[PDB]
Protein backbone atom coordinates (compact mmCIF):
# COMPACT_ATOMS: atom_id res chain seq x y z
CA UNK A 1 0.00 0.00 0.00
CA UNK A 2 2.82 2.37 -0.93
CA UNK A 3 2.86 5.11 -3.56
CA UNK A 4 5.26 3.33 -5.92
CA UNK A 5 3.54 -0.01 -5.36
CA UNK A 6 0.17 1.42 -6.37
CA UNK A 7 1.60 2.97 -9.54
CA UNK A 8 3.44 -0.28 -10.29
CA UNK A 9 0.17 -2.20 -9.92
CA UNK A 10 -1.56 0.17 -12.35
CA UNK A 11 1.28 -0.04 -14.88
CA UNK A 12 1.44 -3.83 -14.65
CA UNK A 13 -2.35 -4.25 -14.71
CA UNK A 14 -2.62 -2.30 -17.97
CA UNK A 15 0.02 -4.42 -19.71
CA UNK A 16 -1.96 -7.51 -18.69
CA UNK A 17 -5.02 -5.97 -20.36
CA UNK A 18 -2.99 -5.14 -23.48
CA UNK A 19 -1.45 -8.62 -23.73
CA UNK A 20 -4.86 -10.00 -22.63
CA UNK A 21 -3.45 -12.08 -19.76
CA UNK A 22 -6.38 -13.34 -17.64
CA UNK A 23 -6.42 -12.10 -14.04
CA UNK A 24 -8.34 -13.27 -10.93
CA UNK A 25 -12.07 -13.67 -11.40
CA UNK A 26 -13.62 -10.19 -11.69
CA UNK A 27 -10.92 -8.12 -13.37
CA UNK A 28 -8.65 -5.58 -11.68
CA UNK A 29 -9.67 -2.63 -9.52
CA UNK A 30 -12.23 -0.07 -10.69
CA UNK A 31 -9.41 2.47 -11.04
CA UNK A 32 -7.48 0.14 -13.36
CA UNK A 33 -10.69 -0.41 -15.34
CA UNK A 34 -11.31 3.32 -15.85
CA UNK A 35 -7.65 3.68 -16.82
CA UNK A 36 -7.85 0.73 -19.23
CA UNK A 37 -10.91 2.08 -21.06
CA UNK A 38 -9.42 5.56 -21.50
CA UNK A 39 -6.05 4.22 -22.64
CA UNK A 40 -7.71 1.77 -25.04
CA UNK A 41 -9.59 4.78 -26.44
CA UNK A 42 -6.12 6.02 -27.42
CA UNK A 43 -3.78 3.12 -28.07
CA UNK A 44 -5.14 1.80 -31.38
CA UNK A 45 -5.30 5.36 -32.74
CA UNK A 46 -1.72 6.16 -31.73
CA UNK A 47 -0.41 2.99 -33.38
CA UNK A 48 -2.30 3.78 -36.58
CA UNK A 49 -0.87 7.30 -36.43
CA UNK A 50 2.77 6.19 -35.96
CA UNK A 51 2.95 3.03 -38.11
CA UNK A 52 5.83 4.46 -40.16
CA UNK A 53 7.74 5.40 -36.98
CA UNK A 54 6.99 2.21 -35.03
CA UNK A 55 7.72 -0.14 -37.95
CA UNK A 56 11.31 1.17 -38.04
CA UNK A 57 12.30 0.97 -34.36
CA UNK A 58 14.05 -2.09 -32.94
CA UNK A 59 12.58 -2.92 -29.53
CA UNK A 60 14.64 -6.07 -29.05
CA UNK A 61 15.42 -5.99 -25.32
CA UNK A 62 14.42 -4.46 -21.99
CA UNK A 63 17.20 -1.85 -21.93
CA UNK A 64 16.46 -1.06 -25.57
CA UNK A 65 12.78 -0.73 -24.64
CA UNK A 66 13.71 1.53 -21.72
CA UNK A 67 15.91 3.75 -23.90
CA UNK A 68 13.09 4.47 -26.36
CA UNK A 69 10.56 5.01 -23.56
CA UNK A 70 12.81 7.51 -21.79
CA UNK A 71 13.47 9.29 -25.09
CA UNK A 72 9.81 9.71 -26.06
CA UNK A 73 8.72 10.60 -22.53
CA UNK A 74 11.35 13.31 -22.08
CA UNK A 75 10.32 15.07 -25.31
CA UNK A 76 6.57 14.75 -24.67
CA UNK A 77 6.94 16.59 -21.34
CA UNK A 78 9.68 18.97 -22.51
CA UNK A 79 7.15 21.82 -22.16
CA UNK A 80 6.80 21.39 -18.39
CA UNK A 81 3.06 20.65 -18.56
CA UNK A 82 1.34 17.70 -16.85
CA UNK A 83 -2.32 16.69 -16.99
CA UNK A 84 -4.35 13.51 -16.58
CA UNK A 85 -4.59 13.12 -20.35
CA UNK A 86 -0.81 13.09 -20.74
CA UNK A 87 -0.56 10.52 -17.94
CA UNK A 88 -2.97 8.25 -19.84
CA UNK A 89 -0.61 8.41 -22.83
CA UNK A 90 2.20 7.11 -20.61
CA UNK A 91 0.22 3.90 -20.13
CA UNK A 92 -0.83 3.85 -23.79
CA UNK A 93 2.80 4.03 -24.91
CA UNK A 94 4.00 1.22 -22.63
CA UNK A 95 1.32 -0.94 -24.25
CA UNK A 96 2.77 -0.30 -27.70
CA UNK A 97 6.29 -0.99 -26.43
CA UNK A 98 5.37 -4.37 -24.92
CA UNK A 99 3.70 -5.42 -28.19
CA UNK A 100 6.77 -4.43 -30.21
CA UNK A 101 9.00 -6.21 -27.69
CA UNK A 102 6.86 -9.37 -27.84
CA UNK A 103 7.37 -9.43 -31.62
CA UNK A 104 11.10 -8.60 -31.65
CA UNK A 105 12.68 -9.91 -28.43
CA UNK A 106 14.37 -13.22 -28.69
CA UNK A 107 14.40 -15.42 -25.67
CA UNK A 108 12.59 -13.22 -23.26
CA UNK A 109 12.25 -13.74 -19.57
CA UNK A 110 9.01 -14.95 -18.15
CA UNK A 111 6.62 -12.13 -17.46
CA UNK A 112 8.69 -9.49 -19.24
CA UNK A 113 5.67 -7.19 -18.88
CA UNK A 114 6.60 -6.96 -15.19
CA UNK A 115 10.04 -5.63 -16.16
CA UNK A 116 8.61 -3.04 -18.56
CA UNK A 117 5.97 -1.92 -16.05
CA UNK A 118 8.72 -1.47 -13.45
CA UNK A 119 10.70 1.28 -15.17
CA UNK A 120 7.44 2.76 -16.48
CA UNK A 121 6.30 3.14 -12.87
CA UNK A 122 9.67 4.68 -12.01
CA UNK A 123 9.10 7.45 -14.55
CA UNK A 124 5.51 8.14 -13.46
CA UNK A 125 6.30 8.48 -9.76
CA UNK A 126 9.60 10.38 -10.08
CA UNK A 127 8.34 12.93 -12.63
CA UNK A 128 4.56 13.11 -12.05
CA UNK A 129 4.21 11.78 -8.50
CA UNK A 130 4.21 15.19 -6.83
CA UNK A 131 1.71 16.44 -9.42
CA UNK A 132 -0.62 13.47 -8.88
CA UNK A 133 -0.53 14.21 -5.15
CA UNK A 134 -1.49 17.84 -5.80
CA UNK A 135 -4.49 17.22 -8.12
CA UNK A 136 -6.63 14.77 -6.16
CA UNK A 137 -4.62 11.59 -6.58
CA UNK A 138 -5.87 8.52 -8.40
CA UNK A 139 -9.21 7.91 -6.65
CA UNK A 140 -10.25 11.59 -6.65
CA UNK A 141 -8.54 13.24 -9.62
CA UNK A 142 -8.23 10.65 -12.38
CA UNK A 143 -11.35 8.53 -11.84
CA UNK A 144 -13.57 11.51 -11.02
CA UNK A 145 -12.67 13.18 -14.35
CA UNK A 146 -13.01 10.19 -16.72
CA UNK A 147 -15.94 8.43 -15.03
Amino acid sequence: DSEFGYIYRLAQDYLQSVLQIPQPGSGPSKTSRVLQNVAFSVQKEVEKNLKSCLDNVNVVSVDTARTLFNQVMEKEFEDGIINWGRIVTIFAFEGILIKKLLRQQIAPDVDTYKEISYFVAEFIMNNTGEWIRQNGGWENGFVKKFE
Binding site: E45, K75, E76, N83, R86, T89, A92, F93
Partner: peptide, 13 residues
Protein backbone atom coordinates in the same frame (compact mmCIF):
# COMPACT_ATOMS: atom_id res chain seq x y z
CA UNK B 1 6.28 12.29 -28.61
CA UNK B 2 4.45 15.12 -30.34
CA UNK B 3 1.58 12.74 -31.24
CA UNK B 4 1.23 11.43 -27.69
CA UNK B 5 1.34 14.95 -26.26
CA UNK B 6 -1.65 16.16 -28.30
CA UNK B 7 -3.48 12.86 -27.84
CA UNK B 8 -3.14 13.63 -24.14
CA UNK B 9 -4.23 17.27 -24.25
CA UNK B 10 -7.15 16.11 -26.42
CA UNK B 11 -8.45 13.91 -23.64
CA UNK B 12 -7.83 16.54 -21.04
CA UNK B 13 -10.95 18.22 -22.53
Amino acid sequence: XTXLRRFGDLINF
